[PDB]
Ligand binder design. Structure first.
Ligand code: HEM
Length: 153
């Protein structure tokens, strides 16, 4: 439900993330976990890293942030034709990891935050509108799969 000009926007600003996906993904994860400590509890391997400084000191956490943003970038480059990518994600997060949909809301907000934090003055208002629509589309399509499963919610 984005226009082509909106998708262009999304994928242009995503180039800034690709310049250093690990650093971006670490920062996303930290924003999520520090703003919403209940999210950290879902990660058995990270749940002992309760503070920003502890999180930052883990290459394992940074590599998971790398996994997360690489997955999301591949989905964004499908410009909404992402059923096959998003299916397994929704299903593992509902059924295996037990992630309520509001945690996808929190990580979408965290991405917007981290874009402005790392690129102050370079994440323009048109780009924030288009990225926000792309994250909404992502989490909306995951929410429809959660609803099939009856998970949550
Ligand atoms: C942009 C949104 C997200 C993306 C693209 C994403 C992607 C991934 C990927 C690729 C994996 C590994 C494969 C899999 O198990 O499906 C994974 C695992 C996992 N995700 Fe997510 N994730 C997202 C959001 C979240 C959120 C919001 C949480 C909770 C706050 C979460 C919790 C987990 C957990 C607990 C695992 C298993 C980690 C482990 O023990 O190795 N995810 N995620």
């Amino acid at each position: 439900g984005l226009s082509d000009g909106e998708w262009q926007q999304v994928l242009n600003v995503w180039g800034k993330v690709e310049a250093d996906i690990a650093g971006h993904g670490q920062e996303v994860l930290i924003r999520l976990f520090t703003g919403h400590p209940e999210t950290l509890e879902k990660f058995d391997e990270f749940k002992h890293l309760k503070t920003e400084a502890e999180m930052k000191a883990s290459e394992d956490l940074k590599e998971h942030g790398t996994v997360v943003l690489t997955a999301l970038g591949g989905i964004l480059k499908k410009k909404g034709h992402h059923e096959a990518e998003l299916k397994p994600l929704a299903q593992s997060h509902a059924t295996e990891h037990k992630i309520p949909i509001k945690y996808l809301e929190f990580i979408s907000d965290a991405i917007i935050h981290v874009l402005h934090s790392k690129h102050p003055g370079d994440f323009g208002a048109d780009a924030q509108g288009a990225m926000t629509k792309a994250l909404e589309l992502f989490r909306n399509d995951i929410a429809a799969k959660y609803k099939e499963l009856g998970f949550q919610g």
